Amino acid sequence: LRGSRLGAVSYETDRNHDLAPRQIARYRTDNGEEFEVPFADDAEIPGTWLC
Amino acid sequence: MLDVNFFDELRIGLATAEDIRQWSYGEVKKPETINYRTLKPEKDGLFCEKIFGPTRDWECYCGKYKRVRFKGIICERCGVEVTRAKVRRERMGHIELAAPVTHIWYFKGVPSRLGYLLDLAPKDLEKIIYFAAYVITSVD
Amino acid sequence: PGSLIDRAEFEAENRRVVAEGGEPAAGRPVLMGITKASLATDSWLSAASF
Amino acid sequence: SNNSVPGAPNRVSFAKLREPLEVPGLLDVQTDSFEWLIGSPRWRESAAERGDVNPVGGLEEVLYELSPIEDFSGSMSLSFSDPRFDDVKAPVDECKDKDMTYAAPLFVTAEFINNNTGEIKSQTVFMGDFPMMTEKGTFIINGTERVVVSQLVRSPGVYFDETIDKSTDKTLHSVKVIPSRGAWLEFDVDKRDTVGVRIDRKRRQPVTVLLKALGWTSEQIVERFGFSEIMRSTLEKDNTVGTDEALLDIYRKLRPGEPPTKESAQTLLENLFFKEKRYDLARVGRYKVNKKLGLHVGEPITSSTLTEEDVVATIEYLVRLHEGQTTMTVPGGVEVPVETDDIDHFGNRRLRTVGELIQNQIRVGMSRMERVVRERMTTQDVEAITPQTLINIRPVVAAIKEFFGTSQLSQFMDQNNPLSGLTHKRRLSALGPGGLSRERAGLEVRDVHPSHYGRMCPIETPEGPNIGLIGSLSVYARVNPFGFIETPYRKVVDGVVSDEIVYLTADEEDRHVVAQANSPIDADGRFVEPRVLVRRKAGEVEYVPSSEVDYMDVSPRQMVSVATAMIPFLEHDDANRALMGANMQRQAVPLVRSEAPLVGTGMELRAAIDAGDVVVAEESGVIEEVSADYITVMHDNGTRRTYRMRKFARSNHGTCANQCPIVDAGDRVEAGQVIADGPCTDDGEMALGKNLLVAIMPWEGHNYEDAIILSNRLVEEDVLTSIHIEEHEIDARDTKLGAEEITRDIPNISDEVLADLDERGIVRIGAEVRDGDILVGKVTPKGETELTPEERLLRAIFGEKAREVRDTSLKVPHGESGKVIGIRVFSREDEDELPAGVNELVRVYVAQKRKISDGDKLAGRHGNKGVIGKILPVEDMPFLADGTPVDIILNTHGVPRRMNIGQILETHLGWCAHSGWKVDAAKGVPDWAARLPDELLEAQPNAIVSTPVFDGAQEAELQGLLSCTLPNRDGDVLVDADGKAMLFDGRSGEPFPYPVTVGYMYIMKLHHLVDDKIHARSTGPYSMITQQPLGGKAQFGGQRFGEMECWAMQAYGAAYTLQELLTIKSDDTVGRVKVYEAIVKGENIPEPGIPESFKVLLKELQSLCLNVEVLSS
Amino acid sequence: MADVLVPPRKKEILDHYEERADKVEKQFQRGALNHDERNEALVEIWKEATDEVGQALREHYPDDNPIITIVDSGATGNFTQTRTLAGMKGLVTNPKGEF
Amino acid sequence: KLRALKRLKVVAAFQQSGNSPMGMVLDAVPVIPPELRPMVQLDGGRFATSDLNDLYRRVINRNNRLKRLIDLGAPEIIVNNEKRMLQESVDALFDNGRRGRPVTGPGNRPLKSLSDLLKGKQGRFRQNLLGKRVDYSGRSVIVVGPQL
RNA sequence: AGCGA
């Protein structure tokens, strides 16, 4: 009697040494609200986004 | 949310809609959980990775940037933020209701809190909030 | 009236209110059972857990 | 002077009396009930002997009450008849092996009739497979072995009682006529004298309303009720009058909101109290009511519905109860005493047996079937249908299956020893469906009403939270066809004790007066002294003159159960410790030798051959061929028969079940003789332990506070050793990625451990295994997961394949070892019955020979339990002057304060039996030995003896026997008349300054062995929703550090240890791995984080729209 | 069992108190008193009998008898258990609570 | 005066704090993180939902039905009935069995709403606060150790 | 569901 999840343990703790260089994009809503989503250097920013 | 043994108060409080939709990270609006065939969470459902975080550490729904070096970013296509797979333990959702709805505890639990606030009998307030009778809310 | 409050808070309130116009709130000692004593505590977490 | 079993050893008895009635078949309460359900010819002829007029089985009864079933039109009907079985589809052992349920088909002749046109459509419908009771009074479901426990339930009928009103100090009498499948009525007297009549728990009604509704309007009330003073008082409190007036008003109350029309009122009363289909006080209730009101003196039992005569007689009897009338000579019937009833008196507490329970379940299943049948009986087109197209057997078979599996009466067979196998049957359980759970089963029903005598043992009952709820049937008790418990009695006419054995229920017990078996019968049926001990109706105890006694007990030990009856000298032990001893006598384990006890009762041979686990020569003859496997018997007329043994079969609690023959090839056997000993049996009779030399002195504190010390002799000579068999299982099933395979091509593992596995997975038979070893090489797909760079380069350097199939082979769990007896492998390729998505099922049977180890639990037959403090070498043991070491050393301090000196008397008598005696009757017989039986004046060494429980060794007789205890080999009377002996300290050497009691005591090894208890966890599995460590030794888990333990810690003030135990050992998910890292690296333990249950709590509160937040200052 | 000595005067004590029990029973039979009064009288009489039997046992046993030794040491057990092991059990309670 | 006291209680409770009473009626209902209402598969594909997913469904389906009804244009009877069902669904989500018949599941078993996760003996305030299983532990039968 | 202290 047991169970599991479709997950990755990925034993890697954390690394603040190198973060894949990333800018931040912003997609204002229809009511003057802004919700920043970071995007990588190689990221292809969308024209519009689900905020 | 995340802090250290710094503790002096635990303040409970009645929450407001702005607080709820500020708490949430997305708006679940489909009554589905998992694709029956591939056994993966649906998009925009009760278990969508975009709304509630990945099920797999440092991985994304469309396998674009599955690595630690890619962290904190959102995969542009599938939209799942890449991070550890325990944010699902914490991230919450919210449902925008097409019609406001009264909370039950403050209506039914005797003594009725709405009954005392609006000076209304519970026997007659049930008839209102369950669409059995009308209420005049203004007069000129 | 009829509400039950801690003796220390009662006395401190009386000390505060003798100034700014003096009126005493009339208090009487009570002997209350342990169930009600425990439930009428100050922390909401403990009362909820009880 | 026992008989029956020809080969039963000549066990000499101290019985001063002679029992007329032999012990009945101890498993009749199961076998006869089941055969009553079926309708077996044996039951048919027995009922012919004992109430011929109506021979009907439980099936026939349910089918008759079902037939006919008619549509609302009434133009067509359906009927059933002739329940009939086929032979079983597979034998007992095959069903047990292949996990099939031992059953046989049911065939019922259905018959559809069409009223308007007129036909009969008769078939033989397969009703379903039905489980069958085996020879041993047990059922076999899915291979496992199950027993249905008879259930004590309040009988339906009319119950009278009164309460006192402290506000008015008046007796308030009432009545409750509670039937099966009916309604609740309560005639009673209010604080103001008025006959309030509450119907179905609805506001009490003036009786006059109901009489008018009965047609006995106020006028007819006067016509019948004349002395009924409260009746005329309520003719004034009637608040109305008139048949239809009261009918309409009452019917408005009865069915509020529905038009109070007189028609529907009449139909309602008919449909609720006189429509059998909707209402029934069953046969039992009808008999109870007709005997309590004496309506029908002897009318054949039928008409399972109330009568208007019955209700008016009830009202008259209740008023007369308030009038305190002596009796009510009902017109047309007999005077019945006007006494209030009890609720625990066994005249009111009937016993549903297996037959009744299965019949009720079948009735419910047939109700569902019937609803479906009548539903489609209209929708289906006429002139086109048949009972084949009408009947549905799915709900019936489902009901039977859901009863036998997953019901708190279809209990798992508790067979760790043959006695337990017997005693789990015959067990009475007052908790069940339609029964009182422990929530409502308070103390009130847990006492021993004086009606239990001879019907339910007062001693045996589980010591846990079930004391009194679960009991066991008496030895001689029998089951009334109506579910009551009849008991045998010897009737005595004019002071002459006959042998006419009449069986009485509790009611007749109360009616008459009962004497004692241990009374001076003067060899003619005639009592000696006139003042005779006797019992009266209310449990009172008196000295009646020897003229009014009309019944006398069949024998002593009639009030005791089976297991308890095997405790020697029981009458000396206190009830508490005797109860403990009875509850532990069922917990012994089968040893490898199973030597019989020296001192016993008569109930070691009978309770052995009736236990079932002993092979019995069916019919007389001679022996042809013996083996360790089978015995061939040559009957006196041509036929031979092979009794197959059961060698090393695993029981339901992992204990051995070996059966070994005792006869020789040339021996002659007679019918009913023991032919092969079972697990705990020796030469026919029970052997639950061993006869050990015992001393009763406190030794070096090791036997401090119930601890026990054994010699190394028991370890060495294998005296106390138990074979244990565990069953491990694994299934190669289908998955999403592919199919799982049992094989040898396992992923990374040295070929060193693959030596035991056979060519095709599973291990070779006999290969010894240790904890963590492989048993079934089994591998399962894992798909594609990108590898960590470190393991990727490890594979690059060590050239190891990915082995996309992950490995989850069957590893024997931690802390277990032993040999591999058998390997039972199934397969889909063999077209064996496997559940969906399963390719290949395999089970492996491991076995171990657990020797007696310190910490195990040993106990005598007097509740003197105890763990083993230490096993000394044989030399450092107190040894007698003859060099014989004692084998176990009990503690003195436990004897006096526990009031169980039965062990001391057993010790003395055991030494007497071991040494052998010779009462030198040179000049006549000594004073003490005058009333001893013959051939007890001398005995041989190691001679077996028996003392029946309540007529046994007297103290004077024991002193006399101990006086002469002829010497062992030289002239050495080691034990003096007192019963003690001079022991030499084996350790230091000097003699002990005071003589010490020594003897032979029979002790048993209990099933609470250390190996099954020791448990530990450093880091193992974890829970799912909460991240706490798991629980149970089946898993690793940890120990629940519960709230009181928290309190203990706070009182100590150990805040840091509390923090550790509640944060970084249970729930700090990121803290556990950090703690482990620090421990391995030798660093410091980190500061706890936040508990996980606390964060869960926070998230639920925020989900409840409660803004919970933490504030710094 | 040789070390469990019975009080020799027990039969005489039993007959003496049995006579009083018989007299109370006779007085109840002749209607001089009701059911509960006679029950109470028997209870008191048998309490007296129990006390007398216990006293006789206590004065009978020696000091080196192991049972009275363990008791009088305070190691464990009260004197009532010895009284009930040898001598008299006394009164036994009803399921309801009466005697 | 007695009623005035009983009401002034809550009235002054709301006045003293910065709490607006708008939160008593609700417009956005939060959804608990999924690992706290997981569907863990058992070995064999027999999935194990958490009994809150069906309630969250009920609310989602009824909300979407209301949204489509209002978009399409529906009579007052249908729209008000739909709002009533939405209300009942939310009340069941928060405390099933409080008002009216408890919402049953298969086997006529009442479902476990959020309130039931805290109330009674089986709440969080007890099951994981009356004690926890702890790592680095063990147990065994005991024997007397006179030489210790 | 059953069981031990």
Ligand SMILES: [Zn+2]
């Ligand atoms: Zn992606």
